[PDB]
Amino acid sequence: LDEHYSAFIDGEIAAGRYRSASEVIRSALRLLEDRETQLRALREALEA
Amino acid sequence: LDEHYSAFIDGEIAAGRYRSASEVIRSALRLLEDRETQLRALREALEAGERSGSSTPFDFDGFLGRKRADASR
Amino acid sequence: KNTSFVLDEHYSAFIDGEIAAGRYRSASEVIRSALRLLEDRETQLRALREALEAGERSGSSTPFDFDGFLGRKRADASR
Amino acid sequence: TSFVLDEHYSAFIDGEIAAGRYRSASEVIRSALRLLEDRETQLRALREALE
Amino acid sequence: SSRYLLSPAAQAHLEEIWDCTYDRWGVDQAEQYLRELQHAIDRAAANPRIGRACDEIRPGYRKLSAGSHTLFYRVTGEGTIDVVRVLHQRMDVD
Amino acid sequence: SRYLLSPAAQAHLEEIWDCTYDRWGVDQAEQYLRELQHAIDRAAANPRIGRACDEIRPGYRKLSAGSHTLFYRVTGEGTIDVVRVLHQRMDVD
């Protein structure tokens, strides 16, 4: 937990986009997982 | 966090792309902040459009004709 | 396995600014993030390059008659 | 400013050079930082124009 | 093609796009590009469902890429499109 | 003025038309191809309106054409050669 990231999380909860710190992080991890999955899928498709 | 994303983080570290749980979480939060900034810019752009006034029929031929005539003088 | 590098004076200042702004902790964190961005770009660029190559290997480029093409396609649907 | 790259990121740079896309490790790294600097500055202007 | 409404912001931007295209490439290019945007507006006006809904962005909106820009529009109770913004593609998060 | 299309690009124009016809009918099909034609005509009059993209492939320029992108070279005259018309999902920016 860093001051820039705690502040961004607090600010996201205050806007009513998320209800808890865990929710923000889960949401951020979902975005990263999807991105990395799309790119691996494009990468492996090219290797084929 | 929950169990599926703990395994996702651990898989990322095992694959050598990331070196710590912190690196994955911070990268993902940066990605989310970036997306949120872009979305907020879009939504405020749409709000400014609604607030610019009631929408009106448009004569595209007259708009183009006048711009062309304006520039030819 | 494990290699060290030195940055020029502009990118060391860029990294200093990113650490000051709070979004990154260290120089390695900025560099590693940037290299993941580059690899993601390169994979998309690879897909575009292969597509252009397939377009070149398609055969010689010729003129194209939009009126005739659109006319023919409309006519065909009318059949 | 100096920094260390582990075996996985070193191998990425080497494959990038071996593919003829760049001439040296420093070129891969500068090109990576250029991409990031452009990204982070645009987003910082967006964040600026926003609030 | 059928009816459409453009917001005042959308109308002002069309003029700016014309002026900036004009200043760099001349009257013919400016007119051609605006004609290209008009084609996409006409397409959406004739079938508002060709633009993809983007409620996740704003409830009741659809978007349609066009040239270097993106139309963001609502649909009237009459079934008319209302083009609220014409935004450069750099702003389109998808 | 004049332009050339690669066999690949011509075949894709036909697929776009057919795909649009099946989903939306003949007039939607025709107008979208005309929209693409305006962008092709734009580039053919001033090939430099397209952004140079040598970092993708030497000699190429690119021009956004709504939901597609034109990738093209300039031949031995002032003439553009449209090698591919790619969906925007592939455009890197």
Residue numbers in the entry:
A (entry chain F): 8 to 55
B (entry chain D): 8 to 80
C (entry chain C): 2 to 80
D (entry chain E): 4 to 54
E (entry chain A): 1 to 94
F (entry chain B): 2 to 94
Task: Show passages lifted from the paper.
The widespread and highly conserved ParDE TA systems, part of the RelE/ParE superfamily, target DNA gyrase. M. tuberculosis encodes two ParDE systems and several studies on the ParE1 and ParE2 toxins have shown their ability to inhibit gyrase enzymes from E. coli, M. smegmatis and M. tuberculosis. Toxin-antitoxin (TA) systems are found in most bacterial genomes and generally comprise small bicistronic loci encoding a protein toxin and a protein or RNA antitoxin. Here, we present microbiological, biochemical, structural and biophysical characterisation of the ParDE1 and ParDE2 TA systems from M. tuberculosis.
Single datasets were collected from 3 crystals and subsequently merged to a final resolution of 2.10 Å. The ParDE1 complex revealed in the crystal structure is of a ParD14ParE12 heterohexamer, with two full-length (‘primary’) ParD1 antitoxins resolved alongside two shorter, partially resolved (‘auxiliary’), ParD1 antitoxins. The ParE1 toxin is comprised of α1 (P9–W26), α2 (V28–A47), α3 (P49–I51), β1 (R61–A67), β2 (H70–T77), β3 (G80–H89) and α4 (Q90–M92), with 3 C-terminal residues unresolved. α1 and α2 form a hairpin-like structure as a base. The primary ParD1 protomers are comprised of β1 (T5–V8), α1 (E13–A23), α2 (A29–S60), α3 (F68–S80). The auxiliary ParD1 protomer secondary structures are the same as the primary ParD1 protomers from residues G2–E55, with the C-terminal A56–R83 unresolved. The heterohexameric structure somewhat resembles the search model, with the ParD1 antitoxins interacting via an anti-parallel N-terminal β sheet (though noting only one pair of the antiparallel β sheets was resolved), and a pair of ParE1 toxins positioned inside a cage-like structure. A coiled-coil interaction is present, however, between helix α2 of the primary ParD1 chains and helix α2 of the auxiliary ParD1 chains, forming alongside the anti-parallel β sheet that is itself part of a ribbon-helix-helix (RHH) DNA binding motif. Mapping these to the surface of the ParE1 toxin shows two highly conserved hydrophobic patches used as binding sites for a single ParD1 primary chain; one site along the groove created by the antiparallel β strands (1–3), and the other site on the underside of the toxin structure between the hairpin of α helices 1 and 2, as also picked out by PISA. ParD1 antitoxin binds to these patches similarly to how ParD2 was observed binding ParE2, though it is notable that ParE1 does not encode the proposed C-terminal helix in ParE2 that is displaced by ParD2. Remodelling allows conversion of two ParDE1 heterotetramer complexes into a single heterohexameric complex, and for every heterohexamer produced two ParE1 toxin molecules are liberated.
